[PDB]
Amino acid sequence: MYLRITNIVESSFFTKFIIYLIVLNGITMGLETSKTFMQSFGVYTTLFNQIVITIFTIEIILRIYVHRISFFKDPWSLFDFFVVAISLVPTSSGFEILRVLRVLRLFRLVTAVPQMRKIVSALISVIPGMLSVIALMTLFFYIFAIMATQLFGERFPEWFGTLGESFYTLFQVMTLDDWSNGIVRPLMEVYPYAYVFFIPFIFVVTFVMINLVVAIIVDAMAILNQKEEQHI
Amino acid sequence: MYLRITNIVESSFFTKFIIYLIVLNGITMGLETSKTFMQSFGVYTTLFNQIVITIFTIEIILRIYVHRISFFKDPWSLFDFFVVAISLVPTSSGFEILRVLRVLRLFRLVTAVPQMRKIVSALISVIPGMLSVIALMTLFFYIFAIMATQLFGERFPEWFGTLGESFYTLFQVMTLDDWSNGIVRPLMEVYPYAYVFFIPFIFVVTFVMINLVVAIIVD
Amino acid sequence: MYLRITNIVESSFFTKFIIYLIVLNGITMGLETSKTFMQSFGVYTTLFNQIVITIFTIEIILRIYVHRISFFKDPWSLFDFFVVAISLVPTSSGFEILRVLRVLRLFRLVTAVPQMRKIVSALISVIPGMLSVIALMTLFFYIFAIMATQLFGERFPEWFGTLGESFYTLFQVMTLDDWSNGIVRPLMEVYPYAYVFFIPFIFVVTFVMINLVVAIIVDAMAILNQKEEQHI
Amino acid sequence: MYLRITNIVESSFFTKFIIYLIVLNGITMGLETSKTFMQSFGVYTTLFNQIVITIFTIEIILRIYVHRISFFKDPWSLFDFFVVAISLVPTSSGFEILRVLRVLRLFRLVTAVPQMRKIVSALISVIPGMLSVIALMTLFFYIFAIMATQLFGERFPEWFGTLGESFYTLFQVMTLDDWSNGIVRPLMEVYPYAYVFFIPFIFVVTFVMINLVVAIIVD
Ligand SMILES: COc1ccc([C@@H]2Sc3ccccc3N(CCN(C)C)C(=O)[C@H]2OC(C)=O)cc1
Ligand SMILES: CCOC(=O)C1=C(COCCN)NC(C)=C(C(=O)OC)[C@@H]1c1ccccc1Cl
Ligand SMILES: O=P(O)(O)OC[C@H](O)CO
Ligand SMILES: O=P(O)(O)OC[C@H](O)CO
Ligand SMILES: O=P(O)(O)OC[C@H](O)CO
Ligand SMILES: O=P(O)(O)OC[C@H](O)CO
Ligand SMILES: O=P(O)(O)OC[C@H](O)CO
Ligand SMILES: [Ca+2]
Ligand SMILES: [Ca+2]
Ligand SMILES: [Ca+2]
């Protein structure tokens, strides 16, 4: 009840099988798209999209029995749990979404192939130092988004009407996307002093983002210099 | 036994009361945004904002005397002073733009929590060693911002008519926000040779603004 | 004649004569443009094409006789071979295909000046350090390009709704090239929550590059750091 | 006489006096950029601009004696030399692109202050390290321009009609500025694979620059 079973899941090619599947469903989806394919090999992809979805469901619950408590202390598996089950809901005969969220099972190659789980994590190994800056921002935008809704708002509702709309347009200014001619000019042509709001908003906004690439090498590589190198 | 006040202003508890009042009034403004809200429930919100503003002109006048060797020489609280100052309807023979300025308060969630006060010291950490090459380029702006008006002001007033008008453009060109067909493909019509002014200038601003990035990291 | 062809080749004169016979094909190529030149005296350069081209495709024999097996194994060598062979094409008649690609022959300068290849290499060296985050990116993109045809390519045929046309548009969205007004405000009107596919897809695709160049700086500065620590 | 007034030049007194003037003249140059001030009042200080250059052009005669063959072998000193010559332009020339060069005399603010001086030296400190790579692409940019006139400029002459046209468009592409929607997608409505020349060009140009800025701690 364990042993015959423990050995199977852990195999060499069963991974290379559910990796051989992950890599397969992903190619029908690329054909599922162009309905020139789908009207010449429809039921194929459709029902291959149901037969594939089950090996992933035994695979998950097999892994669940083998590991038990530790399966549910693995984000890679919880995310596996997350992803694979999101497809378990009957997305067919339903809302657009979960049909198009079921494709998040190609996030599973990431889960599936090893070294893709270090560099993914070498990237998730960055947010702890940044959750300090990340929150300064979120308030800098709560406070300047509002000052926006008020001054513009009626005149320019599509952009800065309701606060979220100020959020959407603040973000857009930030990446500096067509902001020059698109959003500030058109404002400056009825409220001409609106450049007092946005120019030095832009300064705060790229100074900050630059000053966290001066610090991701000084503040994230300061914890990598205190406990790992002095080991000598 | 005198001066018993200075033993409540300083603690670890006063912060979640001011801080957590900041956070409240640092939300009430947000719900003002829903147009509907401030119809059904405006009544509680008009006063809510006022209750803190005196409580804050309390807190601050009650922070005024406890700290004095370094209070006015504390820009955080001077920033807490002037921010709170504007909130009480100044009377200076002036007109109504200030109503929007008060929300600047809810920056007080950074003013009086150290995690959001560690980081704002790491912002102005190396604002010197930078501020010269701010002040250089601010000449390089200014100068090109001269020829610019002095070279394309008769045929292009909207973009570069005056000194100021020329500036607001070069900053875009710098942030590069549709510079080519937004601004230079056109001038190139009345004036065919206007590329030299920007292909160069585009480098200089960005070459500067880039070296500024690598010349700070080692520090 | 093996020792006597090895004297013509790899001699101080081969510089005096190949690097020169290149640069004056890249002066003369700046003149097969602005066609007033072609009508007038263009047959000089239509066949100056051919001097340069047989001057080179003799070298394509000279080098292969001399460095008989040490050529096909040189990185910086198979290019010129390819760059000449691929230029070794019919001068005019046909559909017209690799008539344009000839101008790669100007690349030969990189391959016959050592100052070039070091810089090429100080650039290409950083590749493989990433060549698996490169496909971290293709995997992520693939999931997303699909999630576009099955999302917006009902009403926006130009920007999505196909496996092909969606990869692009997202690419323009990555560089943030007229992204918001230009492409996302439109989709949002048809579907407001389109942001819930791009406000994220941004913060991610940007993120990864920020931590896959921050790699590129630390990758070159963690090698400097090791030979200057065991002895100084 | 030829050794005497070295005492007036090599002095703490000399530099600031000119600096003071070129801050006046720099206040009153940015002021010469004016629709009203030039007309209303500038005709009465259009003399300032010419009695400044007189004092200027006298400065650049004895400095020349102080360093006999060493004036024109100093970087910053050759600069303001040629810079004043352009500024010496007769109140009526041929093509008054030179009356608008006049502002380049305000660049004497960088070559006369040793802070502003050697930061330029710190700037051009990375350029002869970079020369190693700039050329590598003014050959990348130059050939990707060649290949656009024989694909694209008989259906997009405005953009890739000639070399030049392709230089500008290409430079534009690399500033990533409105390139898909603005220039690239339109191309796909006649020649469909325009993107397969355009995307990796993006990557190849995009590759180098980032790799430049990394190993710029070395050059
Ligand atoms: C693979 O193709 C790509 C992918 C990403 C880029 C980014 S786009 C970007 C996104 C966010 C912040 C800045 C940028 N910029 C802005 C500067 N540009 C306007 C000159 C970039 O150039 C690219 O990243 C870098 C440091 O060069 C370029 C090509
Ligand atoms: C269900 C409504 O929530 C949203 O769509 C938004 C969220 C709630 O979801 C958060 C998802 N990031 N956070 C912010 C910050 C958003 C914003 O304004 O720009 C992203 C929006 C929003 C608010 C009002 C109008 C439009 C929109 Cl999109
Ligand atoms: O074949 P197309 O041209 O419809 O492009 C998308 C397809 O799904 C590719 O398999
Ligand atoms: O920006 P200017 O050139 O319009 O100068 C503003 C002054 O107040 C006018 O004298
Ligand atoms: O030369 P002009 O007389 O056309 O004046 C404008 C400049 O030359 C181009 O910026
Ligand atoms: O089909 P909808 O109405 O769920 O819209 C799609 C979402 O807004 C994201 O594209
Ligand atoms: O699509 P074609 O074959 O007509 O050639 C034109 C361009 O080179 C495509 O990029
Ligand atoms: Ca744009
Ligand atoms: Ca843009
Ligand atoms: Ca841009």
Can you tell me which residue has the tokens 């576009």? Answer: C148
- Claim to verify: residue B124 and residue B208 sit in the same structural domain: yes
In contact, A174 and A148? CB cutoff 8 Å? no
Structural determination approach: X-ray
Contact D163 C34 (CB under 8 A): yes
Residue type, position B174, single letter: M
- Claim to verify: residue C145 and residue C92 sit in the same structural domain: no
In contact, D33 and D103? CB cutoff 8 Å? no
Residue A5, min C-alpha distance to chain C (Å): 32
SS3 content of chain A, % helix, strand, coil (to 5): 75, 0, 25
Q: B interface mutation test: which of D86, D95, D172 has the most B CBs within 10 A?
A: D172
- Claim to verify: residue B158 and residue B204 sit in the same structural domain: yes
In contact, D175 and D196? CB cutoff 8 Å? no
Distance, CA of B79 to CA of B105 (rounded, Å): 9
- Claim to verify: residue B29 and residue B122 sit in the same structural domain: no
Q: What are phi and psi of A43, to 5 degrees?
A: -50, -35
- Terminal alpha carbon distance of chain C: 53
Distance, CA of D168 to CA of D80 (rounded, Å): 31
Is the C-beta atom of C11 inside 6 A of ligand 1? Answer: no
Give the neighbours of chain B: at least 3 Cβ pairs within 8 Å. Answer: A, D
| Closest residue of chain D to B140, computed from CA coordinates | D107
Chain D positions touching B133 (Cβ under 8 A) are 119
Tell me the angle at which helices B199-217 and D194-214 cross, rounded to the nearest 10 degrees. Answer: 40
Which amino acid residue places its CA nearest to atom 5 of ligand 7? Answer: D191
Residue A102, min C-alpha distance to chain C (Å): 10
Contact A182 C179 (CB under 8 A): no
> Ligand 9 centroid vs A170 CA: distance in angstroms?
15
- Claim to verify: residue D200 and residue D122 sit in the same structural domain: yes
**Residues in contact with A57: Cβ distance below 8 Å, sequence separation at least 6, in sequence order:** A84, A88
Distance, CA of D125 to CA of B46 (rounded, Å): 60
Best CA proximity match to A9, nearest among A93, A91, A71, A69: A71
CA dihedral of C14, C16, C17, C23, whole degrees rounded to 10:
120
Distance, CA of B107 to CA of B120 (rounded, Å): 11
- Claim to verify: residue D4 and residue D101 sit in the same structural domain: yes
- Claim to verify: residue B86 and residue B154 sit in the same structural domain: no
Contact B30 A147 (CB under 8 A): no
> Ligand 6 centroid vs A134 CA: distance in angstroms?
28
Q: What range does the domain containing C59 cover?
A: 1-114
- Claim to verify: residue A99 and residue A178 sit in the same structural domain: no
Number of domains chain A is built from:
2
Is the C-beta atom of A141 inside 6 A of ligand 2? Answer: no
- Terminal alpha carbon distance of chain A: 47
- Establish if D29 touches chain B: CB-CB under 8 angstroms: yes
The string over D63-102, giving b where at least 16 C-beta atoms fall within 10 Å of a residue's C-beta and e elsewhere, is beeeeeeebeeeebbebbbebbeebebeeeeeeeeebbbb
Count of Cβ atoms closer than 10 Å to residue C74 Cβ: 14
CA A185 remoteness from chain centre: 33
- Of the three residues D114, D140, D155, the one that is the final residue of a domain is D114
- Claim to verify: residue D89 and residue D101 sit in the same structural domain: yes
Q: What are phi and psi of B129, to 5 degrees?
A: 75, -15
**Residues in contact with A137: Cβ distance below 8 Å, sequence separation at least 6, in sequence order:** A208
Tell me the angle at which helices C195-210 and A163-174 cross, rounded to the nearest 10 degrees. Answer: 30
Cα-based angle B42, B47, B49 (whole degrees, multiple of 5):
95
Which amino acid residue places its CA nearest to atom 2 of ligand 4? Answer: B163
- Claim to verify: residue D136 and residue D102 sit in the same structural domain: no
In contact, B108 and B139? CB cutoff 8 Å? no
| Closest residue of chain B to A137, computed from CA coordinates | B116
Distance, CA of A152 to CA of A155 (rounded, Å): 6
- Claim to verify: residue C232 and residue C122 sit in the same structural domain: yes
Cα-based angle D61, D62, D66 (whole degrees, multiple of 5):
130
Residue C14, min C-alpha distance to chain D (Å): 22
For ligand 5, pick from D97, D101, D103 the residue to mutate: most ligand atoms within 8 Å of CB. Answer: D97
Residue A215, min C-alpha distance to chain B (Å): 8
Chain A positions touching C185 (Cβ under 8 A) are 158
Cα-based angle A158, A163, A165 (whole degrees, multiple of 5):
30
- Of the three residues D114, D129, D161, the one that is the final residue of a domain is D114
Count of Cβ atoms closer than 10 Å to residue B151 Cβ: 19
- Claim to verify: residue B108 and residue B155 sit in the same structural domain: no
- Of the three residues D70, D94, D114, the one that is the final residue of a domain is D114
